[PDB]
Design a protein around this ligand. Structure first.
Ligand SMILES: O=[N+]([O-])c1c(Nc2cc(F)cc(Cl)c2)ccc2nonc12
Lengths: 289, 243
C-alpha cells in the first residue's frame, strides 16, 4: 500500500509542466516543493494579467520569483544554462542558501517595501561540476516587487575572455588597473571617440566622465570590486574633441591564474551614440590647439 | 520533522485547490485539476520583470516578420507601425551600421522610437535567416572639478551662462586667480580644509571675476573625492552658485 502511494507520485510528477526526463526522476519531497511552487506561481500570474521556445532561447539571463521570506518560488528552466543548477534543484528553497551571504543584506532589502529594483548578486554556479565545488557567479538582477514578492531577471554579465556573442564596430575594449587607470585600449577607441590609446595609457578613467555621471558610476566601481563584475548605468565619456558620447560598460575583474591575485579590469565598452556636443568643450584635454 | 512539514506541504496544497478547499485523494484531485488546465502569460511575465517584448526580423531585409503586442506598453507604439516595418526604421539613424553588423547568438544596445528615442537592450539569436530577440528597457549655478592645486580641470557648459566665460578660458587656470584678492586666502584655506576634511562638504562665498570683469558674489559648496578602491583623493568637485 506504500507501494502505490509511492507510484502515485509518478503520475503526479509526470503531469507537471516538466518532461518525464525531469519529472520521472524525483524523490517525493522534491515533488512537493515543486507542485506547490507551481501553484503559487499560477496564482500570482493570475494576479498580474488582470511554441514558447523563443522567449526562453532569446533570453540572456533567467527569471526568478521569490517570496519576501526568501523562498524561490519560481525559476526558469534555462537557469541551468547559466547557473548549471537546474530549476528542479532549487524551487521552494531560500535564496540565501544559494547566494553569497555578504550580499544577502542587499538581497534582504530589495525583497522588501518605488517598487523598482536593480542590483547585482553572487550566486552559486557549477558549470560542469558538483555543488561542493560550486564557484560564485554575478547576476545583474532587474525587476519589480509586488503583492510581498520579488520578481526579477538575472542576467549574467559575461566574461570578456570567453565570448558567446559577436561584437560590432561600435564596440571597443579596454583594460584598466584597479585604479581604473588605463593600461590598455583597442584602437576602435580612435574610430569611435578620437582618443589614440598611447595618449590615454597613464590616465584614470575618472578624468573622462561627464560629472553628472560620476556618482552613478562610483557605486559601480565599488560593486565591480566587491562582486568582481558590473554593468554600468549609461554615462557620458568626454570625446577627444569637444562633446561626449554615451556609454555602457561591462567591467570584469581578471585574476592571475597561478597567482589568484587580481590583475586588472576588462571592460567591454558599448558606444551608444555619436558625439553630441562637438560644440561644447568640457575638460582641459579637449582644449589643445 | 520530515512528516510535519510533509503535512504542511499537503495542507496548503489542499487549500489552493478551490473546488477542493471548498492523502491519495487530495493528490489525484490536484492532478485532475492540472488536467483541467507557462505561455502567453510568460509574455506578461517579461513585460513585468524585464519590461521587455519579443520580436523577429528577417536578417537580410531587416523586416519585422513579427512584433509582440507588448511593443505597445513597452514603446508606446502600435503593432502596425511595426509589422509593416523594417527595423532600421524603428531605431535611431546613427544606430544603423551597428545593426548591419548585428545582422549563432546576438545581443546589443540601441535607441528605438516611440523624434524621441529610448535605450533598449536586445538579446536573441539567429534562426531560419531571421533573428529572434527581446527588446528590454533598463534604467542659477554650474559645476566644476579641480585638482588639489585649485586649477580648473573640468567645467560645465552652463559656465558660459553663469560667468560669461567659455570653458576654454576657465580650464587650466587656478580658481584663486578669478578671486577677489581680499577673498583669496579665504578661498585657499577653504581648499586646504576641503582636503584635510576628506569627502565632506564645505561652503564658502566670494566675488568672482566675470568675463565682463565683474565681482560676482558666489557661494560654492564642495568636497574631496576619494577613489573607491584606494580611498585616495584626486579631485575636488564644486558647485558654484550665483548669489
Ligand atoms: O576604465 N574602466 O575600467 C571602466 C570603463 N572603461 C572606460 C573606457 C574608456 F574608454 C573611458 C572610460 Cl572613462 C572608461 C567603463 C566603466 C567602468 N566602471 O568602472 N570601471 C570602468
Amino acid at each position: 500500500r506504500r507501494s502505490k502511494e509511492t507510484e502515485v507520485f509518478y503520475e503526479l510528477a509526470h503531469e507537471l509542466p516538466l518532461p518525464h526526463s525531469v519529472s520521472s526522476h524525483l524523490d517525493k519531497a522534491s515533488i512537493m516543493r515543486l507542485a506547490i511552487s507551481f501553484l503559487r506561481t499560477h496564482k500570482l500570474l493570475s494576479s498580474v494579467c488582470s511554441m514558447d521556445n523563443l522567449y526562453l532561447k532569446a533570453l540572456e539571463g533567467f527569471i526568478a520569483v521569490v517570496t519576501q521570506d526568501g523562498d524561490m518560488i519560481f525559476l526558469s528552466e534555462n537557469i541551468s544554462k547559466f547557473m548549471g543548477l537546474t530549476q528542479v534543484e532549487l524551487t521552494g528553497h531560500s535564496i540565501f542558501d544559494f547566494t553569497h551571504p555578504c550580499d544577502h543584506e542587499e538581497i534582504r532589502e530589495n525583497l522588501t517595501l518605488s517598487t523598482e529594483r536593480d542590483f547585482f548578486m553572487r550566486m552559486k554556479c557549477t558549470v560542469t561540476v558538483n555543488l561542493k565545488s560550486a564557484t560564485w557567479k554575478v547576476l545583474h538582477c532587474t525587476g519589480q516587487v509586488r503583492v510581498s514578492c520579488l520578481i526579477i531577471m538575472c542576467e549574467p554579465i559575461q566574461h570578456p575572455s570567453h565570448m558567446d556573442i559577436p561584437l560590432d564596430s561600435k564596440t571597443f575594449l579596454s583594460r584598466h588597473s584597479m585604479d581604473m587607470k588605463f593600461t590598455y585600449c583597442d584602437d576602435r577607441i580612435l574610430e569611435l571617440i578620437g582618443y589614440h590609446p598611447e595618449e590615454l595609457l597613464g590616465r584614470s578613467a575618472y578624468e573622462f566622465y561627464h560629472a553628472l555621471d560620476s556618482e552613478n558610476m562610483t557605486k559601480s566601481h565599488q560593486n565591480l570590486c566587491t562582486k568582481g563584475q558590473v554593468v554600468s548605468g549609461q554615462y557620458r565619456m568626454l570625446a577627444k574633441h569637444g562633446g561626449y558620447v554615451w556609454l555602457e560598460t561591462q567591467g570584469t575583474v581578471i585574476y592571475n591564474p597561478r597567482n589568484l591575485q587580481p590583475q586588472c579590469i576588462m571592460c567591454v565598452n558599448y558606444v551608444l551614440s555619436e558625439i553630441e556636443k562637438n560644440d561644447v568643450v568640457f575638460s582641459m584635454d579637449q582644449t589643445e590647439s | 520533522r520530515r512528516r510535519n512539514k510533509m503535512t504542511a506541504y499537503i495542507t496548503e496544497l489542499s487549500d489552493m485547490v478551490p473546488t477542493c478547499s471548498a492523502k491519495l485523494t487530495i493528490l489525484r484531485m490536484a492532478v485532475s485539476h492540472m488536467k483541467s488546465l507557462t505561455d502567453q502569460e510568460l509574455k506578461h511575465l517579461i513585460l513585468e520583470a524585464a519590461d521587455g517584448f519579443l520580436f523577429i526580423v528577417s536578417c537580410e531585409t531587416g523586416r519585422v516578420v513579427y512584433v509582440s503586442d507588448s511593443v505597445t506598453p513597452v514603446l508606446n507604439q502600435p503593432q502596425s507601425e511595426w509589422f509593416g516595418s523594417t527595423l532600421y526604421d524603428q531605431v535611431h539613424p546613427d544606430d544603423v551600421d551597428k545593426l548591419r553588423e548585428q545582422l549563432s547568438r546576438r545581443s546589443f544596445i540601441c535607441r528605438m522610437r516611440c523624434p524621441h528615442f529610448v535605450v533598449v537592450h536586445c538579446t536573441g539569436y539567429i534562426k531560419a535567416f531571421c533573428l529572434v530577440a527581446i527588446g528590454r528597457l533598463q534604467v542659477t549655478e554650474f559645476i566644476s572639478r579641480h585638482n588639489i592645486e585649485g586649477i580648473f580641470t573640468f567645467v560645465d557648459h552652463r559656465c558660459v551662462a553663469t560667468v560669461g566665460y567659455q570653458p576654454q578660458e576657465l580650464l587650466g587656470k587656478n580658481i584663486v586667480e578669478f578671486c577677489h584678492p581680499e577673498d583669496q586666502q579665504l578661498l585657499r584655506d577653504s581648499f586646504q580644509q576641503v582636503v584635510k576634511l576628506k569627502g565632506q562638504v564645505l561652503s564658502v562665498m566670494f566675488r568672482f571675476r566675470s568675463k565682463t570683469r565683474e565681482w560676482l558674489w558666489m557661494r560654492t559648496s564642495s568636497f574631496t573625492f576619494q577613489n573607491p578602491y584606494s580611498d585616495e583623493i584626486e579631485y575636488i568637485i564644486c558647485t558654484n552658485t550665483n548669489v
